[PDB]
Structure formats: structure tokens, C-alpha cells
Amino acid sequence: DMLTLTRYVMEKGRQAKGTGELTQLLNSMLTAIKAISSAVRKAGLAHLYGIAGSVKKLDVLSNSLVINMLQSSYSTCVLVSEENKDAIITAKEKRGKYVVCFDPLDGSSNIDCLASIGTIFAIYRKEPSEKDALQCGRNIVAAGYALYGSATLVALSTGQGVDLFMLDPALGEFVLVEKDVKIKKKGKIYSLNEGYAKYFDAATTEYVQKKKFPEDGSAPYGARYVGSMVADVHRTLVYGGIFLYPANQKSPKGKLRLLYECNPVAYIIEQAGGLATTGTQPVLDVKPEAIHQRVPLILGSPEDVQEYLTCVQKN
Amino acid sequence: DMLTLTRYVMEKGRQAKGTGELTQLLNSMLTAIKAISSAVRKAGLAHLYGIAGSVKKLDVLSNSLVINMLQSSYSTCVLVSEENKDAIITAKEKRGKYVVCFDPLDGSSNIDCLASIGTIFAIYRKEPSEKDALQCGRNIVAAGYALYGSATLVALSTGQGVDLFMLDPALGEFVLVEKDVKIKKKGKIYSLNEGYAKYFDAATTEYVQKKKFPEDGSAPYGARYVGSMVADVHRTLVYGGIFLYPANQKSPKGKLRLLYECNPVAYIIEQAGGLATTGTQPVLDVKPEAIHQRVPLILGSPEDVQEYLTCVQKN
Amino acid sequence: TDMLTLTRYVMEKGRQAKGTGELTQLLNSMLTAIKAISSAVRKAGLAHLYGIAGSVVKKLDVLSNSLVINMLQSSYSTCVLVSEENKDAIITAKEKRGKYVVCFDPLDGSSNIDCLASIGTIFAIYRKTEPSEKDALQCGRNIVAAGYALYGSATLVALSTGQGVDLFMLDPALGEFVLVEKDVKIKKKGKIYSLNEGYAKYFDAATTEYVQKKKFPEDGSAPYGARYVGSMVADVHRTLVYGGIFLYPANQKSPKGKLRLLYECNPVAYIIEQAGGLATTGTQPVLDVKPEAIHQRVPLILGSPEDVQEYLTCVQKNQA
Amino acid sequence: TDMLTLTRYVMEKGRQAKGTGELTQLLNSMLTAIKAISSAVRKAGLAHLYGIAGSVVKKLDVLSNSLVINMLQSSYSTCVLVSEENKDAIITAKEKRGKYVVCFDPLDGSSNIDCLASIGTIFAIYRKTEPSEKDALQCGRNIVAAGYALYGSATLVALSTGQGVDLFMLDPALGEFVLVEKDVKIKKKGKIYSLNEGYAKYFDAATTEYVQKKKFPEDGSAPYGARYVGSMVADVHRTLVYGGIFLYPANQKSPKGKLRLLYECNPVAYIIEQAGGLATTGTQPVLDVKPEAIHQRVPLILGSPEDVQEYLTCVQKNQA
Ligand SMILES: Nc1ncnc2c1ncn2[C@@H]1O[C@H](COP(=O)(O)O)[C@@H](O)[C@H]1O
Ligand SMILES: Nc1ncnc2c1ncn2[C@@H]1O[C@H](COP(=O)(O)O)[C@@H](O)[C@H]1O
Ligand SMILES: Nc1ncnc2c1ncn2[C@@H]1O[C@H](COP(=O)(O)O)[C@@H](O)[C@H]1O
Ligand SMILES: Nc1ncnc2c1ncn2[C@@H]1O[C@H](COP(=O)(O)O)[C@@H](O)[C@H]1O
């Protein structure tokens, strides 16, 4: 009923009988995301190219947008960013009770070819230190992502399923476009970098073979891989299927990051009725041991993820 | 020096000692592209969702934008659109000498997952009929594409190499960001739907094997496939490598369309020093026989395309 | 504060007031309608009306009204709305009913749309006292919050919830209002006077005497400058930020004034008073007028207190 | 025509004139600077100044000036520029030199930025007669093209290249100016008069007599309405589209007028004349004044011809 993400989030906080602290935190995150979308679409580019006579930065700017909007919310005590070596402890004067792990601009190596890129975040309730960010994903309070693709979208869950919002740039607000989205039980797309096939384990090799060469008279799955995690994960949510960045010979711990990439999208996919696993346990059950820890990631439609796990247990 | 695409195109027409007719045509195309970018990013979405009490269309709108901007230019006599069964003959009162083939919104099945999508066009100099659009790609006067990705970009050539422009949404104009772009002689990315491997020919199977399992001590290529042709072709241009939608058992004539998909991107890639082939001849040398003809498409860095052709000739 | 955006700022003020979140949702709703109106006023989508895809004022009035009514009703915070555009009060559907009453002019500055002059949106919010138009007939002393949006060279909102006036500017690249001045105070005395002197023939003696003294001062000072955009929000906002006086007094052709008490004069009188200025009908504060009908007119004289005092002095002298 | 956008329209007019494309490139350049200025006036990027990423008027003047100067110089169409913001004429670098001279006010309406009133950009283009400021001292009769942008509730450009006045509105969703009225003609007689009556004490007899007749007509008609935004582009544009009269005459404190001949009065006089109106100093057409210095001031009275005639009549009578 509420139409805009601002009114929707407020109304959900009123229903939760919250003090307004998490609401201010979500308000601040979403404001950072609007500022990042504006910069990603290249507002102001002409000034860069000398229109007024004056002729990686996006990484730094997006990081600064999130850090400053979150710290000034008075809702946080600890932040972990993909862009910072150490946890960032909120100034005592501005301390609230939430911990936020985020990748402010994910996929951002691919800005050069203008691929879809995004922002990922997970929020936890907490003397503050990096240990406060080492909670397993089962403890998530809220999480979500922004996708800067053909349009700008946010996926958000606070524990009651997944809602989708799209940014209307004429209005400057996110509009609710889908409530309580559920992933297909089984899809027909598989998504991984097959350029690593030389380094796969046996299970992964066998699983990919079954997708391309089925034995049960079914059509082979179609393949997609943007190489931008938010884009591939969002397509998996809305179309169904499976997304994988498993461990391989060259990346034995996996490549994607547990705190601010894997846990947030695992939380979204599970809230949507999907599964997300390292191949040996659910991602949300991994007890994090360091803030920039890598883990393997396999997620999507539950029947597809289940077939993958069945290959793993075989081999 | 000219900074904006409008001034650049005008200055190029002055240098060509043109009558202004092709310039008005390019002006009209670019205006259509700005209108499409605005709609693709979802300006006005909130009005759709009832903000004022009033609660495939993008395909139709983009088609109408291009057709109306081109016809009203007074520069055209024949249009071919991906969206129309028959060629569209310009009203005699508005007739000029150019023929335009275009796909007004390509990749547009993928709007639902917000994948990058685009607009592709090729322009020919011409009693007008569909036969006027059946010229081989060697006859192209100008061609290019718009990519609606993390930002909006245009690639444009009028026969003197490829220039890249980016839309600054704060200014409302395209800004020149790269002049005379040249593709790498050899890249390290291969791009195709391996979900069709069951249906590949021997050459394609062998080529993909060599990318994943090289014999000369080199690292395997990385794999990318957005499944949106403009996005994959633009990444091939700026990063190098190879893009393929070859014929297969299920699509024996190929899938992509010669007039308004394959010829325009072949023209751009060759202008940039790359190669584009059906696997039996250069795309730009194919003599079109029908306006919605399909052809196989293999293009990108010349050494990569050459390795592919060497596999084809082998098998 | 540190809140930076209007959204965080309004939320935080609601937290401090220990509200239930109902007035916050109402204010969020109004401000969303104001952003939608700004977009339309600046003519987003004009090219489509002029046939870019092959298909070629009252418009904008109706649209702006529909934006405000729908955003307010769907907030679940309202029971009664009064609009400049509707003859009767609009009663909120019972299942959406909350406790607030909103009086608004969704797009003020009619004489000016066609020449692109600055125009605006004006509103005042009351708490209800079964709902009916009588809930909107409260004197301005009962205002809970009030404000205006100015669609000028940039889009600005002035808002007060009873602790002074704060000014916010819309950053169109961000899509949000940014706090640019907190607790603004009007100058004690200005140097601009603002009224339509084309009604000179119809003025009362007091107005004639006051205007004459602005042009031909008796104290050795320079005459005041004159400005009159003819769009009340633009003139009142300049009065707020530069000081001076704005007037649309009663005259022979408009013996009760021209401007509307509920949704033009009360809201701006509240803003001006909250900023340390004065707002009078000429005989009493605008905020003390007891409304008798929802489209009632009243005379309006407002701005810097020394200036409004000099005008009231002309009134009492000429009335004695 | 059918051209729809300002870009196609200007290109097509250049094709019809059989130009080399040099004036077209100059006009494209000016219009790009105007879009960049509109974006900045509406405060794109404000949130970044206020610290959204941790980093917290004269500004806008300098920016707008730099936008116009760089876009014009890089067109390769110019040899001499005169700006309201620069003491001396600006000579184009020899390797960028073309044949046109441009006089402009990059951001007119200073008294109004802070209160967000409508403001604008004004320009006039001449063909050169080695380049120096003398190439800018041509009377307005030699104008090749002239125009203004109004940053009001929406952004509008008025442009004439000598075949009447066309009006274009910026669609900010598209990023282009759209033709909204071709060959606009001012009313023969209006019902609005526009001047700063705060200078009444300093007026000449003619101005005093004229203003008195607007408020107290002698012919049984209703008095004229008054409007005065105090930003010349806004007042002149309203005069164009609603009719009536706009004045900033000489007065005792400004005996040669206040507004600037080269880049305020000549351009708008050209626009007004092209639309069938009159523009006078009070003693001769503005376009006939032979400029003697690049920041020369002149009195300006312009608008509907019957109104300007009634003002000129007051002048001749009171001068006899
Ligand atoms: N806007 C919201 N949406 C959903 N849940 C919320 C919201 N605000 C608060 N909650 C829930 O209530 C708890 C307490 O909120 P808070 O008092 O603001 O820290 C949160 O940790 C959430 O579980
Ligand atoms: N803006 C332009 N950029 C590059 N080449 C152009 C341009 N305008 C015209 N030409 C070239 O000159 C030819 C004649 O132009 P036209 O007289 O406008 O039909 C074209 O077919 C192009 O080869
Ligand atoms: N966001 C706010 N800003 C200022 N005052 C507020 C706010 N929200 C609530 N209040 C005050 O608290 C009262 C009750 O709030 P509510 O429970 O939301 O109706 C209001 O009528 C205001 O006086
Ligand atoms: N785009 C245009 N619109 C109207 N008149 C033009 C245009 N371009 C050129 N002209 C006229 O033709 C003359 C010579 O043009 P140019 O060769 O571009 O300097 C100009 O000084 C104008 O009088």
C-alpha cells in the first residue's frame, strides 16, 4: 500500500515497534545507494571533460558515501567494508547498536565495459571491535543489495521475505514493484565462469556436464555469466536456476567474500525460498573467522542447489 | 576538441562537405537513443504504480521513438526494424536518400533481470522498396550502438574508426570519452552460450576446449556471457577476446539477425581493427537475401577470430 | 543537526517528540508529492506531448491536486483534506482514516504558470477535534505543522513543526531534500515592500499612506525597493530570507481580501511567526481568525516586525 | 516545422540559410552552456557540498561565466566575447578564431539567486567588422542572432535569427529543448506594467505621469496590474508572452539607466522587436544606440507597441 521504499520501511518499523534506530540506518543506506546510482550513471561527466575549462575514484567515492551516511545515522558501532583493511569503529559520540558489512561497489572492475554493478550489505545487532562483525549469517537483522543495471533496483529483507524496489529517477524515490518474491523451485540457467574448468573439482565438472548433456530427455540448461555477482545473483532470483563460484585449484578457499558478499546474498536467496551453500555447509551457518574471509558460493533454486550438493557428496 | 557528440557529428559533416542530411539523420537517431535511455532507466515508474491515483511496452515505445525521429528527419526513404514484419517506406513528402536498419531495443527479453540492453543501427545510401535494405555491410555509411548498462554509451563509426561517447544525464548530452578505439590483437575472454554445447559443430567444440585447456602453457581464457548482444560485443571491443553465436544443430542458420544486429556490430568491430565472420565469410560480405535473415556470428580480436577460423577449416 | 536529508531530519524530530510515526508518515507523504510536482513543473516528459514517439496548465493543477490527495490519503494519517481545487472538504475513506487534517494549495501561483514564473505548494496540518469539514475550520493557532515548496530557480521547502523554520533544497541528482538552513530568523526591519500597486485606486487610506512613505520616506532614509512576483509563495519566501514586507490588503474590489485563509494565509503566517516575523489581517493576527468557511478569504500583511508595525500604525491611525 | 528539437531546428535553419555551419556550431555551443547552467542553477550536486561523502552565489556566477566562455571559444566560431563578468573584452586565441562576436550576461538576476527567484542567461551575436573590443561596439541593428534562457519554474529559451521569435522548453528527462511556439507575436496592447516603483522619488516627470495613468486611468478602463520580479529576463519574458510594458528608465540616481546595452538591452530589444513589439531608450530605439564602451548602461522601455507608444507620448510631452 505504501508505494515508496521510505514509507514502506517506516511502516515496517512501526509494525516492529522499533525505536526508529534501524529505520534511520536503512534510510541512510538507501540515501547512499541513490548517490552511488547517480555517480555510476555518470552525472557530472561533462565537467570532468572540460565543459567549464577544467579537464578507481568511483570505488573511493562509493565507499565514502556509505561510510559517512551510516556513521551519521547514529545507528552504528562497527562497519566492515570491502575497501578497508580494518573494521571501522564508529566514534563513541555517534554510536548505536548495529553492525554493517558492505561492499560499496561490487563488480567495479567491470565499470570499464559498463557491466551491471551493485552495492551489497548485511546488518547485525551488536566494547565495540571487529569481533562484532564476525557473527554467522543466521544472526542477520536485515540485508539486501542495489543493482545498477538497465535500471536501478534494490532487493531488501528484514526477515519477512524479499521485496523489490525500483528507483524512479524522475521522482528520486524507490517504488515497491514486487512484494515477497519467491525463487522458482527449479530453473533452467546455470551461471559460473567455465574459464576455470581446468581447475574445478570432480563434482563441479560432473554437475556442469549434466546441465549441458542431460540423460533424462530434458533440454540442456542455458548458460549466463555476467561476471558481476549482484547481476548474476539477481537474475538467479527472478528467473531461477543456479549461480556458482565454487573453490577451485587456484582459489582453494573460494573467491567471494563471506561477510559482505556471500552472507548478504545468501540471506536474500534463502528468504526467497532458495538455498545457498559453500558445498560443505549453508553459507549462513559458516562461523566467520576473519572479516575478509573468502568462501565458496553456490546458490539459487532449491532443487538445483540440491542436485549440486548431491554431486558433491558423490565425489 | 568538440566535446559533445552533437558538435562532433556536426564538425565531421562540415569536414565531409555534406549537405546536412546525414547529420540530421544522426541527430535524430541520437535523440531517439536519449529518449530510450530515459525510459529504460524507468523515469515515470511511480506514475505507473499509482502515485497520482492511477495504477513489451518498452519494445513498442522504443520502436516508435526511432521510427518517428528517423522519418521526421527528412533524411530517410526505407527503414527496417527488428519489430516490424515489412520494411517501412518513408512517406514521399518526407523522403531523403538514406536507408536505416535497426533493432530499437536489443536484449529486451532481459529487461526483467535488469541486464544491460541496447539499440543497434546501420545506415545505407539508397523507387524505394525493401530491396534498398538488402545491401551488403561493405556498403555501410555509418553504424553504431547504444548500450544501456551501468551508464549509457554510444559507439559510432562513419568510416574513420570507432568513437565512444557517454551520456551525462545531468547535462543531457553525450560526451566524447574515447576517439579511434582499437581492439586488442588478442584477448583473454571467450563469450558464448555453452548451454548449447550438445548442439555445437566440431570446430566450435574444439575451439572452446582450447580456451579452457590450452596446450602451450598459457592460462585458460576467462568466460563471460551476459546474453545481451550489445553488452557482450561492447565488452569484446574494450577488453578484447572473442564473442560467438555460431550456427548449431537447433539454429542451423544461426540466431542473430544480419541487417540490424550482425552487420552493424561487424562494421564497428572491423573499424576498430577486429574481425567479424559467419564462419564461412566475413559478415560484411554476406549478400543479404531477406530483411530478417539470420546469420552465425563470430567476432572480436583478430588473432582470436583467426584461431576460430583455423578450427573451422580443420573440421 | 547531522541528519543532512529532510527524510532523516523529519524522522529524527519524530523520534525526539516520541511520536507514534503517524505525523512522520504524513510529512514523508507530502514531501513525496512535492518531489513529484517539482518534476512535472520543470516539464519532465514534455517531448512526448509534442510527438517524439508519434503521438502529439489546468493539466498541471489537476495533476498536482491528484498527487497530494493520493499521497496524503494513502499515508493512513489523515481524516479530512481541504484543497484549493475542491469545492468541498474531502473525507478520508474510513479504513484509511488517521487523526490529522490537511489544508493545502497544491499549485499556487496560477497567473504565473504560462510565463514560467516561480510557483509553489502550501500546506497546514491540524489534529482532528465523525470527521467533517468542521475539523478544518480551526484557527491557525492550532497548527501542528506547516510549510511550503517553492518551484523557483531551484526547488526549496520551508517547514516548521513548532520549533522554528528550517529550509531544505532539492538536489535533483540525488532525489532528496538537503537541510541548508536551520532555525531561520527574519530580519527585524527590511528594505523591500511587495504588493500589487495596480490596485492603488481601490486601496484604503492606511495602505495609500504606507506605500507613500515607502517611496517618499520622512526620516532621511533611502526609499524601499519594490518587488512583486505575483506568486505568493515566491514573494513570501523572499520576505522571509531578505526581510521587508508583503501585502495583499483588503481593497474596494476585494473587501475581505483575495488570498485564502485555510491554505494560503494561515500556513505562511505560521512560518513567518515561527521565524520571528508578524502576520496580520490588519486588525488581528492571521492565526487568530476563526475560520467560518473552508474557502474564506482574508487580508494578509506579513514580514519583518518593524515593517508590519509601521503598517499597523497606518491602519490604527486611519481607522480612529 | 517538424524538427521538434532545438538541435534539429537550428541545423535545419542553417541548411536553409545555406550557411557553412559556423553559426550553427556557435548556437549549439551556447545552448549546451545553457543546459549546463540550468543543471547547476537547479542545484544538482548540492548534497556533496553539504557533506554526503564526508566533505562539507559568486560560485554560480563564475561557473556560469566559465561554461559560456569555454563552450563559445571551443566552437571555433568566435573572435571576440564580451561578458557581464569581465572588465575587458575577451579575444579568442588565434588558432580558434572564427568570425562571430558574442555579447552575453551568463547569469542575469543577481538580486534574486538567494531567494530562488527566476534568473536567466542573455546573449547577442554579431559578425566581425585584427579583432578587438571595437568589434563588439556595433549597434543592435547589426545583430545576427540573439536570445535568452529563463531558469524559472521550467527552463525556456527564446531565440531569433531574424525571422521572428521561437520558444523552446527544456525537457529534463530527455536532455533537449523542444519547440513549443513558433513565430510568437506580442499583444498590441497589454494590461500589466512592470518597473521598480521604489525609485518613484527619482523618476522624471514622464515616468511619474505614465505610472499615475496606469493606476488611475482617464478613459474609464480598469487600472493595469503590476508585476516586477526584479530579474530582467523573467519580467521581459512575461511581457513577451502576456503583453504590457517593462521599464527601467533613467532616474536621478541612474541618469543613464541601470541595465547594460551590449548584453542585456540590445538582445531583449532584438527579441521584442522581432515579436512585433517596441524597445526604446525613451528617446530612440535601443537597437539604434551606437555603443561607446562595452559596459555602457542605457534606459530600457519595452513591450506591447500601444503601451510603449503611450510611454513615449509622456516623454515627448514632458520634454517639450
Ligand atoms: N524498519 C524496519 N523494518 C523491519 N524491521 C524493523 C524496522 N525497524 C526495527 N525493526 C525490527 O525491530 C528491531 C528493533 O528496532 P530498533 O528499535 O530500531 O533497533 C530491529 O532489530 C528489527 O528486527
Ligand atoms: N556528420 C557526418 N559525419 C561523417 N560523415 C558525414 C557526415 N555527414 C555527411 N557525411 C559524409 O558525406 C556524405 C554526404 O552527406 P549528406 O550530403 O549529408 O548526404 C555521407 O554519406 C557521408 O559519407
Ligand atoms: N516528525 C516530527 N517532527 C516534529 N514533531 C513531531 C513529529 N512526529 C510527531 N511529532 C509531534 O508529536 C505529535 C504526535 O505524533 P504522532 O503520534 O505521530 O501523531 C505530533 O502531533 C507532533 O506535535
Ligand atoms: N542555424 C542558422 N539559423 C539561422 N540562420 C543561419 C544559421 N546558420 C547560418 N545562418 C545565416 O547564414 C549566415 C552565414 O552562416 P555561417 O556560414 O555559418 O557563418 C549567418 O550569419 C546567418 O545569417
Numbering used by the authors:
A (entry chain B), B (entry chain B): 9 to 63, 71 to 141, 146 to 334
C (entry chain A), D (entry chain A): 8 to 63, 70 to 142, 146 to 336
Give the published text.
Fructose-1,6-bisphosphatase (FBPase; EC 3.1.3.11), which catalyzes the hydrolysis of fructose 1,6-bisphosphate to fructose 6-phosphate and inorganic phosphate, is a key enzyme of gluconeogenesis and glyconeogenesis and, more generally, of the control of energy metabolism and glucose homeostasis. Unlike liver FBPase, the muscle isoform, encoded by FBP2, is expressed in all vertebrate cells, both in glyconeogenic cells (e.g. muscle fibres) as well as in cells such as neurons which are not supposed to synthesize glycogen from carbohydrate precursors. Mammalian muscle FBPase is about 100 times more susceptible to the allosteric inhibitors AMP and NAD+ and about 1000 times more sensitive to inhibition by Ca2+ than the liver isozyme, and it has been hypothesized that it may be catalytically active only upon association with the muscle isoform of aldolase.
Inactive FBPase in the T state in complex with AMP [T(+AMP)] crystallized in space group C222 isomorphously with the structure reported previously for the E69Q mutant of human muscle FBPase by Zarzycki et al.. The asymmetric unit contains two independent dimers, chains A–B and C–D, corresponding to the C1–C3 subunits of the tetrameric enzyme. Crystallographic twofold axes along x (in the case of A–B) and y (C–D) generate two full tetramers (A·A′–B·B′ and C·C′–D·D′, respectively). Each FBPase subunit in the T(+AMP) state binds one molecule of AMP with full occupancy. The ribose is recognized by the side chains of Tyr113 and Arg140 and by the main chain of Val160 and Thr177 via a water molecule. The O atoms of the phosphate group interact with the side chains of Thr27, Lys112 and Tyr113 and with the main chains of Thr27, Glu29 and Leu30. The muscle-specific sequence allows the anchoring of the N3 atom of the AMP ligand by a water molecule, which is held in place by the main-chain C=O group of Thr177 and the side chain of Gln179. When, upon the R-to-T transition, the leucine lock is broken, the Asp187 residues are no longer isolated, become fully deprotonated and change their conformation to form hydrogen bonds stabilizing the catalytic loop L2 in its dis­engaged (inactive) conformation. Specifically, the Asp187 carboxylate group of subunit C1 forms three N—H⋯O hydrogen bonds to three consecutive main-chain amide groups in the L2 sequence of subunit C2. Binding of AMP and transition to the much more compact T state prevents the aggregation of muscle FBPase and increases its thermal stability.
